[PDB]
Amino acid sequence: EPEVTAKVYFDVMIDSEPLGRITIGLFGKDAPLTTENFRQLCTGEHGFGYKDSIFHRVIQNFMIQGGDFTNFDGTGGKSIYGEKFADENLNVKHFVGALSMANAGPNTNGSQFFITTAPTPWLDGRHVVFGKVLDGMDVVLRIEKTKTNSHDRPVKPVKIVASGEL
């Protein structure tokens, strides 16, 4: 596993129920542009970020996805460098608890990401893995079990009520 160079977190709630804190370690040496984008979106330094956004898609035994703080449906989001930035390292394979960038083809990274909860070999080589859950994996597993309906979207919003750097 690559080196963790920075730690960020998310405090999560589901309609009045606090689920706890998810601590994420970033691989700053293996993916500098990607980790910096995630880090600054967590702090909200530029005026926008993950605070008060939701996990809009949950697929049991696969992953949870979030990061669309502009449209809240999977069609939006934007990086700190602009609308899109290139793929940095595609040689790191996914593993349970990995943080990976969602995208719409090569060099289209923005702000959306997923946290994998199971092996996902069909994503390997196509999505940049830039970190991993260091603590609070139980919170991730709880979210994965939340009731979804049509489109794999949680019936109750799964909200990130706070984010930042640790």
Side-chain angles (χ1 to χ4, degrees), residues 2-59 61-148 151-166:
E3 191 172 306
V4 173
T5 70
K7 297 183 182 182
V8 294
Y9 77 94
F10 290 144
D11 284 336
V12 182
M13 284 195 102
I14 300 188
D15 176 48
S16 89
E17 204 67 4
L19 269 57
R21 176 168 295 165
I22 298 176
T23 303
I24 295 157
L26 303 173
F27 305 149
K29 292 189 306 166
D30 297 68
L33 286 221
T34 311
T35 56
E36 270 303 299
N37 175 63
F38 195 81
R39 201 201 107 243
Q40 287 172 47
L41 288 179
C42 278
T43 63
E45 285 166 49
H46 306 263
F48 49 92
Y50 296 136
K51 178 181 190 307
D52 291 334
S53 60
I54 65 167
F55 285 98
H56 65 276
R57 190 123 153 293
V58 163
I59 305 173
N61 295 315
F62 174 21
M63 56 92 256
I64 61 177
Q65 181 182 355
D68 182 354
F69 53 75
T70 58
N71 295 232
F72 301 79
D73 64 3
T75 65
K78 68 189 155 187
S79 80
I80 61 175
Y81 313 115
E83 178 183 47
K84 308 297 169 195
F85 58 101
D87 295 315
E88 283 184 303
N89 180 21
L90 295 168
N91 295 170
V92 175
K93 50 193 304 183
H94 295 74
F95 49 85
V96 171
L99 271 280
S100 173
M101 293 299 287
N103 64 51
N107 309 318
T108 57
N109 300 293
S111 62
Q112 289 185 59
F113 59 94
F114 5 80
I115 299 179
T116 61
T117 55
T120 59
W122 63 88
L123 290 183
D124 288 334
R126 280 142 287 178
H127 294 271
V128 177
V129 176
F130 61 94
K132 72 171 189 174
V133 177
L134 298 180
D135 186 50
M137 191 61 209
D138 54 299
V139 181
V140 172
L141 300 181
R142 170 118 87 118
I143 294 171
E144 174 181 57
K145 291 289 190 295
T146 201
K147 189 162 56 200
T148 63
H151 300 324
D152 309 308
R153 27 204 185 73
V155 177
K156 305 273 290 184
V158 179
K159 182 173 180 180
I160 293 172
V161 296
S163 64
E165 175 157 29
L166 246 33

